Amino acid sequence: YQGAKLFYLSGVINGRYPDREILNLSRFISVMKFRPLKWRNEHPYMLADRFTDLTHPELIETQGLQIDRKVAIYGYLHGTPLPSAPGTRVHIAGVGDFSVAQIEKLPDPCPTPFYQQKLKLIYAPMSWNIGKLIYMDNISPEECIRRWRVDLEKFVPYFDTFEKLAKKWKSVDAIKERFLREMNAAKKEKLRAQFEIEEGENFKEYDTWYELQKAKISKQLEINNIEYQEMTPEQRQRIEGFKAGSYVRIVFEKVPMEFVKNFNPKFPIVMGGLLPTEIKFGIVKARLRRHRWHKKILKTNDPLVLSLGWRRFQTLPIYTTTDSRTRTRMLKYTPEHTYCNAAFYGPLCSPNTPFCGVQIVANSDTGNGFRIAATGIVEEIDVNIEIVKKLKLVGF
Amino acid sequence: KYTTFQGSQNFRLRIVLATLSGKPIKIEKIRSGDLNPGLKDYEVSFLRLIESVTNGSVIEISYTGTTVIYRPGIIVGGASTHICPSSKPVGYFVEPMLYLAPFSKKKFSILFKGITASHNDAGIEAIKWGLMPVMEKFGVRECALHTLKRGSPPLGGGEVHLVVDSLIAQPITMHEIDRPIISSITGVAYSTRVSPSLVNRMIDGAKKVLKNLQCEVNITADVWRGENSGKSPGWGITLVAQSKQKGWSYFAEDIGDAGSIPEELGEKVACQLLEEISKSAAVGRNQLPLAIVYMVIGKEDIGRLRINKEQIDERFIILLRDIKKIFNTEVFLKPVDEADNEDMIATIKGIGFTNTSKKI
């Protein structure tokens, strides 16, 4: 954005920059505020602060190093709360998809001074309550009801014998509440209570429509905060899971042994949660263009490394046009300076998920040209597509 | 790999929940010990219905029929016609479709053919005035069940058309912590291939119980005669208690058998409705499962629903356990601060479900 701050550094002394400029940069970072991002606020993610291998050494020997390894990843959670129960699907960048074997919260290893004093500055490791009886699966549901005191295909719920009920509801008392000189005040007060019942909502302000929406979101957020606070810490974690900022230990199983061996602390390990759609595989209908600074147009059935959500992968897309909205016709190449409808097979994702494409990821083939090849927005997800092309028969 | 279940218990619910959540499931030991093991015909027809409205789904039945493997696809909907076997009425099939319809790529327009009423399954009015209003609260603005032909048992002959124009990202978060004040009692009294007198006698029985009340009672008389009356004579009543305050409804339904007294059924359903009101806090027992599921598939936000102690019965237990096994969501219950009643607030956080099938 125009007016973006740009800091200037002259030289390095004893492996340090001028103190004055660093002071200004530190202050600027301190007061910074962050915009809400759609993706970051819709998935749980964490950056691995340390890495550990929990595979038993004997197993490494009796079977060999080839054996798959059990590893533990630690770090701070971000974004939406991560569910407490194991089995959640999650992706590690450049490794693959795994399922959390276990998860447990640890004390903050770098507590902020405000947090510490309510209850070291650098941390660089790499360098018969019925509610319970519902979920005790051992107890049968019939057993649960009696202690604290048939099937859903039958929509009509169980009712007592007709005659017994007739005696029960001979009088209408016990349900009257559900239905709608000194005594005068009583009549008006009852009448006052009747009025707010019968016209209350229509009658029950913010200056702008924007403020109204922000009020609705904030009010709902406040309702969340109150509800969790009442609940016990164990009950809170049980429902929401591990909230962002919680330091969590996460154990994975069936991790490739290469990842253990191929560990460079410089290269970060990024963990990202997956929604149900991300797990699905199928055809992705997307809208795509050649990037402006890429020298060359793309070709149909040509490999392209896409970056959707948390995952990076290579596929063979097919570039298409609607042909004035009569058919989905195959193209040979992307348009020079406009988008085109592209179809490729890969992990599905929610619409409106943007992405970018690159043709070369290895350094050896880098050259000098711009490496960003295509950009686009995913439009629709489906399990089939009917791409067609013009075939012409020629006779004399 | 597969979440495993047992028996035919909650067969429809387990299928839809897997369909919504997108997790594969396996249901085993279906009527293993019975003389006729495996799925019933209507259960098999029910699965065919899921295949029709979904794309990419894989459904495998065992050689013995006692085990099913289900790998859900996406919801695509579209226009189709389903023939209901005589073992079950249309409402047995319309009810599960209700859960899935608002979250489809294309609008649901399904024509259901078969018997239209029964003693154990939802009736037409029950869906029209008893379940569909609950969705209107949850954000399904446009939903309609058109009654083309009524078919009474045993020969049926009826037709109903389900159309839901509203496609939404997910149900709105629910906030109901009070006891709705129900303003009036309405209902539909219907009959087929018989004289209008039966409808009149039946409303007479219902009013006799309900005349003591302080709310107006207006029951519609829907006499079906001629070609559109189906192939068999039949008659039944529905009574709905309405809250114009926050658009809440409680209802009771039964149908009459041959030789039964029209006055007696009317008195029974009226007495049945009062019990439902006594047992209800914010939704009726017959409405509760739909409400629970919708909150579960809401945004990542805490929704509140007031429930009476009477609604916590054996059925309610399995519904939550079934939901947990598939969604991992747990319904937290807390007491209300009031002493007049012993009600409790059911608080559920939605799983952040979104309708990703709909094109943008």
């Binding site: - | 295949e51 979904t54 990419g56 495998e60 039945i61 065992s62 013995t64």
Partner: peptide, 10 residues
């Protein structure tokens, strides 16, 4: 359409 019911019941 994609997918189908695999009925191996006799």
């Amino acid at each position: 359409k994609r997918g189908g019911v695999i009925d191996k019941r006799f």
